[PDB]
Design a protein around this nucleic acid. Structure first.
Lengths: 206, 150, 123, 205
RNA sequence: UUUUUUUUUUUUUUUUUUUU
RNA sequence: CCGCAGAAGAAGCACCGGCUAACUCCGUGCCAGCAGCCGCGGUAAUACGGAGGGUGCAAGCGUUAAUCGGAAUUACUGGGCGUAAAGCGCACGCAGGCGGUUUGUUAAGUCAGAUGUGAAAUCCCCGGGCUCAACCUGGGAACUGCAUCUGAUACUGGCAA
RNA sequence: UACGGCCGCAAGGUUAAAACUCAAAUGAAUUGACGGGGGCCCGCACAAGCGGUGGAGCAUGUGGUUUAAUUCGAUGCAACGCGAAGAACCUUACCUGGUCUUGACAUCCACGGAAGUUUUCAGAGAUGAGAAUGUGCCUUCGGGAACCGUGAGACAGGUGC
């Protein structure tokens, strides 16, 4: 009957920021219009390997974008012509330059996000995703974590059918503000309407 | 390469003070391909968790049924309140035509030849709780020899 | 949980309830339409559905419905009888099959195919 | 009587490798298993207990091409037979006149084969017996007739089945096109991938 | 095993599809 | 049967919940209608009533007047009596059912068979003959009892003690 | 339960028959209705008390008056001073008229332009008819900005629960 975030409530406690910047009394408003715009271009340019963390720092309002993506080599491309585009389009909206910093998503198996970017791929085949769903969860937990719960909502059958499915491969203490837990979500579609997935990953006790 | 199946559940959810209260149960069986079969029950907050607590309980050692070789030699008493019950063997070549209301109690070890459907009650909890206690009360081909000599 | 209160109206929506009184032989028949009735004020606003009575040795009087489409269902005719009491109708206990003799019913309604017996349109 | 098709439709709801269409190309290219067969509900179907046997019924009804009439008039006498299901019922479908002719190599499909038989091309020791429920007993012979013997359809069966398994229970001469059943069928090499016993227990629900 | 501080307060329509 | 001549010349019904089975786009306001167990319609009616697609099966499809099905039930052959229904406050004797239990004994019923009946389409099984499924049949068989007798002694009934 | 009588002193006892009909339940075991049970209590519940509200006079929304004609939804524990903490420009319900249906706001190409200060006269307002003064920054004189147009083809919305 609740959905209760472990993250967010805890920015300085094992669970680090999606973004952080210091804009002043009469210089926030444009920074906020740019924090969705810069993330929309990137999270469509980086889709080919996802982005666990789409990190917006702005060291002098110029934007130090740190992209933890599971394939940096495909966004370095054939060696740095994409980087050039990647440092221009997000700087075109913001009116200032853009300190593009790359990284790997170190093992998507154990990750704070990339488990939901298994699952929400599986729907692009349109056939029996049930063969692979709870197997993907299984596989992920075989290289890391100690419990996980999963909730999936949406049009996932035929004609008019709309339900919610819930699974538990291991124990999850829902909120413990000391622990290495995460919450995440992701999305998918199937030509009848939405398919929206949610996770809770109790990876460790502290 | 062990075998795992369910057979029954309760809708168990009721009015109270007060709105509605809900709960979640199972009844399950397990087997080993060398003529071994077993059972038990569970409960949880979640349905596929009431299956796991059951099937971890069904894994207790699994009774070796007297099977020589594709059928069985005696109909053991599955004594219950009015179930009765008695299986009917068949001559080694024709299949497991038994009560699909409980059939997984004999199916999980592979047993090809036995029949009888659920003779006095159409509730699985009744012809289940009866069958497993006849199967533990059985005798080997080697025992019935001693029973009629030495 | 209290049976002489429960039994009436619990949970089902087809239900058994029907009341189908007398027998004497069989319930199907040929039906001399004996006298035609057109009347009796009710909340179901029952126009044109001209019920008739039936001279049958049964112990009490009996009555039967127009079955379906066909205005000239005339009181000298001897069409066929079967059971099925539609909730619309007090007093009645059977409905006709009114297609034989001179009665017609089904004038040109192409959808009847085997349902009442009709030939194909311009196909 | 045998409904006739669309033929490849049957494979997109019954399954893969069907002898219905055994020959050229349309295998894995067009039979639409794993791609998307029942496309509308393919996100999630749900099966049934009668479900899985009723499509294994379907398999046996549509692969060999037979009525529900035959499925009851083979059952009539099967009720006297002494053996198991996959000898009292299944074994007969590989050995009725319209279905043995493909097993020997006189037509390249099972829908072909029945139609060569019904068109007076085939005999059993001198009998034109196109009453195709007629089942060819072991050792008595079965041939294509003289002017149909080396007709285009037989060759394109023979030079395609050449690389394939020639099963042990019957034989043929490929160059004068005649044969028989050499022994009785067995539930251990008959090569239908089906669970045999399950078409007869389906009448128990 | 003394247990009357008044007797009564119309109907409905609540119910988030289903195979497990 | 054998040459020519054309895929020519041959097919549709239930329908479509869920029952063995495939569904939506809408309509009409428990209108009008299915009414079998169900289930449906109370302004978003999956099958009512129009239609569009395809399905079950193919001279066949729905369905009907009923009775048993599944379901176990008037039970010598097959039974529940705390339950539905269910040892009926109560038993003077008159007919009735059960009359102790073993030896010497008998064979009427019990059983085993000899021989007869049930000539011919069985039901149950094999072998054919028409091109053959049918169909048309040949062969083998099994028919509690009844007769008329050779046995065999544990029950049913007795005789003696 | 009676429609023959065996009994009974009548009324009834005892046979448990039947015209016809019509769809499942008794029992366990579990609910717990808001409950002056017994029992454990407890609160301006009630206590002891205190200052009142009330009848006449005012500030004022239902309903209630017919008024030319009237704005929902408000009507006990879960609604009071509506939501309006300004129902005569007023964040427009509604009575009326004036007007429109890309409206008022806002893009993607196409052809073009410097932006504005000031006053006169009409009109209820939206809007209508005149008169003066004005002409910026780069600057490939290319491309245009600050910033106003007219033609397109895509094309805008609201407490509706």
């Amino acid at each position: 009957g609740q959905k209760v975030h472990p993250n967010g409530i805890r920015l300085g406690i094992v669970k680090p920021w999606n973004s952080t910047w210091f804009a002043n009394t009469k210089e926030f408003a444009d920074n906020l219009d740019s924090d969705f715009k810069v993330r929309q271009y990137l999270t469509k340019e980086l889709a080919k390997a996802s982005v666990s963390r789409i990190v917006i720092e702005r060291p002098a309002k110029s934007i130090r974008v740190t992209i933890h993506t599971a394939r940096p080599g495909i966004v370095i491309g054939k060696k740095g012509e994409d980087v050039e585009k990647l440092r221009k389009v997000v700087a075109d909206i913001a009116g200032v330059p853009a300190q593009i910093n790359i990284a790997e998503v170190r093992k998507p198996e154990l990750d704070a996000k990339l488990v939901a970017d298994s699952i929400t791929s599986q729907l692009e085949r349109r056939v029996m995703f049930r063969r692979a769903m709870k197997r993907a969860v299984q596989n992920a937990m075989r290289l890391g974590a100690k419990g996980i719960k999963v909730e999936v909502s949406g049009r996932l059958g035929g004609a008019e059918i709309a339900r919610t499915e819930w699974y538990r491969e291991g124990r999850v203490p829902l909120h413990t503000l000391r622990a290495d837990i995460d919450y995440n979500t992701s999305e998918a579609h199937t030509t009848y309407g939405v398919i929206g997935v949610k996770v809770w990953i109790f990876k460790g006790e502290i | 390469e062990l075998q795992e199946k369910l057979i029954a559940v309760n809708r168990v959810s009721k009015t109270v003070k007060g709105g509605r209260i809900f709960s979640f149960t199972a009844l399950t069986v397990v087997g080993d391909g060398n003529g071994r079969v077993g059972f038990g029950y569970g409960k949880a907050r979640e349905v596929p968790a009431a299956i796991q607590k059951a099937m971890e309980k069904a894994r207790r050692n699994m009774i070796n049924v007297a099977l020589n070789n594709g059928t069985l030699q005696h109909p053991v008493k599955g004594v219950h309140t009015g179930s009765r019950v008695f299986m009917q063997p068949a001559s080694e070549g024709t299949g497991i035509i038994a009560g699909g209301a409980m059939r997984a109690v004999l199916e999980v070890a592979g047993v090809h030849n036995v029949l009888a459907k659920a003779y006095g009650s159409t509730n699985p909890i009744n012809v289940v709780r009866a069958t497993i206690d006849g199967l533990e009360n059985m005798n080997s081909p080697e025992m019935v020899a001693a029973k009629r000599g030495k | 949980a209290t049976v002489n209160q429960l039994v009436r109206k619990p949970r089902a929506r087809k239900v058994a309830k029907s009341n189908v009184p007398a027998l004497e032989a069989c319930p199907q028949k040929r039906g001399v339409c004996t006298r035609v009735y057109t009347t009796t004020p009710k909340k179901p606003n029952s126009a044109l559905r001209k019920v008739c009575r039936v001279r049958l040795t049964n112990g009490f009087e009996v009555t039967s419905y127009i079955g379906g489409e066909g205005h000239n269902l005339q009181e000298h005719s001897v069409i066929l009888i079967r059971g099925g009491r539609v909730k619309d109708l007090p007093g009645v206990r059977y409905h006709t099959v009114r297609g034989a003799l001179d009665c017609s019913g089904v004038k040109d309604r192409k959808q009847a195919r085997s349902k009442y017996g009709v030939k194909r349109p311009k196909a | 009587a045998r409904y006739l098709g669309p033929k490849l439709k049957l494979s997109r709801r019954e399954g893969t490798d069907l002898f219905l269409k055994s020959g050229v190309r349309a295998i894995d290219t067009k039979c639409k298993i794993e791609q998307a067969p029942g496309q509308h509900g393919a996100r999630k179907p749900r099966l049934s207990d009668y479900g899985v046997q009723l499509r294994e019924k379907q398999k046996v009804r549509r692969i060999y091409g037979v009525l529900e009439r035959q499925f009851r008039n083979y059952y009539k006498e099967a009720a006297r037979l002494k053996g198991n299901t996959g000898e009292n019922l299944l074994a007969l479908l590989e050995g009725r006149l319209d279905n043995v002719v493909y097993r020997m190599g006189f037509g390249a499909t099972r829908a072909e084969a029945r139609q060569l038989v019904s068109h007076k091309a085939i005999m059993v020791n001198g009998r034109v017996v196109n009453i195709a429920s007629y089942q060819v007993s072991p050792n008595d012979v079965v041939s294509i007739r003289e002017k149909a013997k080396k007709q285009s359809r037989v060759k394109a069966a023979l030079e395609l089945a050449e690389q394939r398994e020639k099963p042990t229970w019957l034989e043929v001469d490929a160059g004068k096109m005649e044969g028989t059943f050499k022994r009785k069928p067995e539930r251990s090499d008959l090569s239908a991938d089906i669970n045999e016993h399950l078409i007869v227990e389906l009448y128990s629900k």
